Amino acid sequence: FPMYNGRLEPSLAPALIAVAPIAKYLATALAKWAVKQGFAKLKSEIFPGNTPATMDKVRIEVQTLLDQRLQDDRVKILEGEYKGIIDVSKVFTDYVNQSKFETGTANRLFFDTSNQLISRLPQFEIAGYEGVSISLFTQMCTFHLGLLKDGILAGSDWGFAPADKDALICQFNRFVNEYNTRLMVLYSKEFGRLLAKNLNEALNFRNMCSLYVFPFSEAWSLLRYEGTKLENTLSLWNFVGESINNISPNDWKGALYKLLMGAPNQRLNNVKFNYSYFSDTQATIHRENIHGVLPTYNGGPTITGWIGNGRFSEITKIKQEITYNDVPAATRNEILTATVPTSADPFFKTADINWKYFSPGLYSGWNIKFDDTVTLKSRVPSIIPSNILKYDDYYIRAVSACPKGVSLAYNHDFLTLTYNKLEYDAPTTQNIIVGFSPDNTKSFYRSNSHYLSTTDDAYVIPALQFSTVSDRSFLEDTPDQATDGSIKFTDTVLGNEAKYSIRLNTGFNTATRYRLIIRFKAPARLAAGIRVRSQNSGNNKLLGGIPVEGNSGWIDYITDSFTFDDLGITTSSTNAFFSIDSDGVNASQQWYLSKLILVKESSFTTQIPLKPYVIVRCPDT
Amino acid sequence: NNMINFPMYNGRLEPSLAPALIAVAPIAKYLATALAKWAVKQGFAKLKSEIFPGNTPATMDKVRIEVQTLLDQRLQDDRVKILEGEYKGIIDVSKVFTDYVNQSKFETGTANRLFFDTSNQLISRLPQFEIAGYEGVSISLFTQMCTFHLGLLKDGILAGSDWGFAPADKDALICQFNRFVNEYNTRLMVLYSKEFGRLLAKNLNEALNFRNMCSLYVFPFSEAWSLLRYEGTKLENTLSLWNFVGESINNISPNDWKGALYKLLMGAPNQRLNNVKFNYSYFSDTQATIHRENIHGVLPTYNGGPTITGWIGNGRFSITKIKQEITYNVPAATRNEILTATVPTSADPFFKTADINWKYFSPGLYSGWNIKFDDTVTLKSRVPSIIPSNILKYDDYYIRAVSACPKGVSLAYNHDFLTLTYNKLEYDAPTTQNIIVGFSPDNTKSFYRSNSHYLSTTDDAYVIPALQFSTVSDRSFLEDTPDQATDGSIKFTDTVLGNEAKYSIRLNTGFNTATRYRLIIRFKAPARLAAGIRVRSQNSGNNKLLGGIPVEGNSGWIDYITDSFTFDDLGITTSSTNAFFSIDSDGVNASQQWYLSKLILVKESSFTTQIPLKPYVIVRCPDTFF
């Protein structure tokens, strides 16, 4: 049975899922919002033609991808909630889209739609079914936040006094964080449940959220502004091997996900497998096993080690043939190696890794193949089915594994980005995990630098796509950021910094005025704060000194306007950098770095404020 | 297996002379005073009274017998009387010039002639101290003679018209000082490399003994030659002393020493010792006649990074400890234990003295080890006989590092990967069978205890050695540059990313933050750097550039003096705990690999460049041609 990622039917391409047009429109609306029309166009994508057809298509896709189904009664309930949302949203849309309308009536019909979603939203936080309902709950919160943004920008045009306008801004800032928290509650409940049930199943749920959920939670954090870029750099993970369960979310956060990422800023160079073959004297037993996986990436500052072991329970390969007189008659322990080819595209695209245990138990072998190069064909006398691991518009960035037979709760404080060797010893792994990264990241991982074009209104620099980083820095899984993670700075005495190499493509307008948006989470007050700099061949320019007073949520800091002529960066500048540094932090002052966003000053604008305009404070009870 | 039962002192029967009581110590203590404030027209008179006190060769005779005793090398009797006559010639001519200038009034044209009678007397008699085949003993003598001549030229330069030197005659002396300060240094390293290279192939313990002598008798003065053209600096020596205990190791190349062994001995050059682990194995036979102890590896762990240290030798048992007792009908007792020597946690967290000894007995049945630091016994030999004491100790010195040399393997592998950071500093070997102890002078206790350079407003100059850093970039190596009177330099080789190194600095309570200072950077950049070398200061986000050094390429060490500044301009106060001094550059290829020796913080009021690099009047220096 030719399998596709363990399934008998090939999965739908990521660029063709039902939420793709919604995500493509949000990318356009985040670059330039249509005043008093953004909600009408968003409604046309979430409910096309005033039908729940997209929400039905989203449901059946996620139900097929997760193998989880909603009850028949709950489906007809959601159908009624959809009709209620569609009916009330169309009435408000048709009335404001006239040549002349009474602003007092549009205000009434607005609150009929605004409060229709607030009261019907918990119907999508389905208990015991949040694995499927998280993708539906994601669109309803996008539908309501889009309504609140158009209501703020309309104001008097829709019957909102300056005090009514600030009440909507207060709801926006509350719901942009409440919907995010309620989204992570549905995610953690299901991802935590599946980590203890089946690791391959837990990865499959995270892959679904990386395409149906997390791109839109990032759009929420960008819905405040105009002129940024919606970018998703999350990775997809396929699991091949024996089942692994009873994984806790703490083990994933502080160990397993760190081993899977490997060197988060480097491409794969070669991966090594601890392979052992066993055959009995009657030629009836054939058992192949993978005891360890050693991924070597294209550079530092991360040092990788064995996941599992490289031990033969330095020798490259050892064969053995034994003859007895009435136990192994043939024994082969070999360190296999799959090498990434040196070319203009130094990445693996597809993989054919499969593991099959036969019913009597005598046969159990592995197949390893990347692109068209066969690393291991099973020595089992029978053929092992093909298991194509691939995603369209995705490439293989990392190949790792999960330690088997050991607890994943050890050495969490020492699985850092630098200094310490990124490894986790185990008797065996018997599994191979492949990380697929989207093609939009292929430019950085090929050249180890961020090339900038003057025709782009915004560029997103993920935190994990760095050049160097300080010691005592960790990797934090922040999938709600539409990225593969964040950096957790924990150095106590010396400073905490991280540099990002930048290059200017030929023909770049070095005179255009840019701004830098820094997304970070600093929970405690920092006396010296956080500094943003740029280093080009000795010309160290300070772009901003972020005042840190303490906040539990993510904070976007927008530096003052600047140009690359002020920074001394040209086309031939091969030593340009962006630096984010701070002083030593204690346990409470440990802060996180999400991403850097370079926007044009002409196109960037903060349409929704963090604080109301007229009223002193948001309404309190 | 020697039949002499004596309490040994570093392998010798008699305790060695204290480092501060050696014969060249008064010469070194005067040079440190002259570099802080040079006595015009008297610097050579006072230097002559220390090298030749009372117009006698008594000091040079004491220096000779001390180095000959320490090195166990003896100059030929004929060659001693030769140097005796050469001393008399130098004493006679220098006394005539000194007595004539030290009178009430003297004719300046006469003091000009008697100056070159003494100058050309040293230039002609100097090759008599470059004795071929005896460079081990002669290097201590050749060092003082160059100190005698370089101090003579400096006094003549600053005198000028007082000793009959026209502005053209003054430039002629400046061109000689600039030539001899590099020619004498090159000729000095020729004598050192010939002998330290010979003994590395002969006996490692003997080669370390020679380097210990040069660290006290030679290299303190080569550094004084580099500081001789200034006034207001500090003459500091931070070289370490290395004692060897164990079986003989020979056939070591200078390349094996430069790119491997010396890195293993230093361990973490910016940290103090925390604990040392030894791979110990005991063996006894069923006849209760054989008792063999072995040290198969040494694992030194220091107080921090960024250097990651590993095993020198191995930690394998060929588990912390395993005891075996076997009965047969010929190993009957086998103990494989990883011993540990932990530096105490106190206000002075350093070992002072050690008692490490290894004795192989004549029949071959007994061979054990004794390991003891301070009053804590790490290992008492289980050999039935007592092993003599071997006190490793230098007054005014403390134990900074404890390492070993890999035995049974070549030291020419993995040189490109024995770096300061990233890669684990280790060298696998079947056995070491030796323990090497590193003694650092007490002047470095302040840094290695606090991991920071505390500055006092009462000091006219402070020396920051390159190896006493807080952080350093990747692909940075350790270069053994003993002519800098330090434990080495930093070789920056990172090709793509930048090359930087930070130095943590603190201000003692009562420091005057308004006083003006300057920074002196010594570096050897053989190729031109487009972006050059940048000197900065980082204090809690306040990055101040102190200077951008233009680098165009030079084969020698270059001293760059930044513009004057104050700690008020840098925002550094007494309570500033995150202050740093940065030395960054861009990526360098193979040819552009540069070195960093040290940083010298001097007060602007006390610092002056008294001898220039270029002459004043003449456009170019006169050459040696006809």
Numbering used by the authors:
A (entry chain B): 17 to 329, 340 to 352, 361 to 655
B (entry chain A): 12 to 329, 341 to 351, 361 to 657
Publication excerpt:
Cry11Aa and Cry11Ba are the two most potent toxins produced by mosquitocidal Bacillus thuringiensis subsp. israelensis and jegathesan, respectively. Cyt1Aa, Cry11Aa, and co-crystallized Cry4Aa and Cry4Ba. These are produced during sporulation and are remarkably stable in a variety of conditions, but dissolve after ingestion under the high alkaline pH levels characteristic of the larval mosquito midgut. Solubilized protoxins are activated by insect gut proteases enabling binding to gut cell membranes, subsequent oligomerization, and ultimately gut cell lysis leading to larval death. Cry11Aa and Cry11Ba structures maintain the three-domain organization characteristic of Cry δ-endotoxins.
We sought to characterize the conformational changes that ensue pH elevation, preceding dissolution of the crystals in the mosquito larvae gut. As the crystals are naturally labile at pH 11, we aimed at collecting data from crystals soaked at slightly lower pH than 11, hypothesizing that early conformational changes would show but the crystal packing still hold. In the case of Cry11Ba, 2.65 Å diffraction was preserved up to pH 10.4. Comparison between the refined ‘pH10.4’ and “pH6.5” structures points to large inter-domain rearrangements induced by pH increase. Detailed analysis of structural changes at the side chain level was yet prevented by the non-isomorphism of the “pH6.5” and “pH10.4” datasets. A 1 % unit-cell contraction, and hence tighter crystal packing, was observed in the “pH10.4” crystals in comparison to the “pH6.5” crystals. However, because a higher glycerol concentration was used for injection of Cry11Ba crystals at pH 10.4, we cannot exclude that unit cell contraction might be caused by crystal dehydration. In the case of Cry11Aa we could not collect data, while in the case of Cry11Ba, we obtained a non-isomorphous structure which, while showing possible inter-domain rearrangements, did not inform on specific side chain rearrangements.
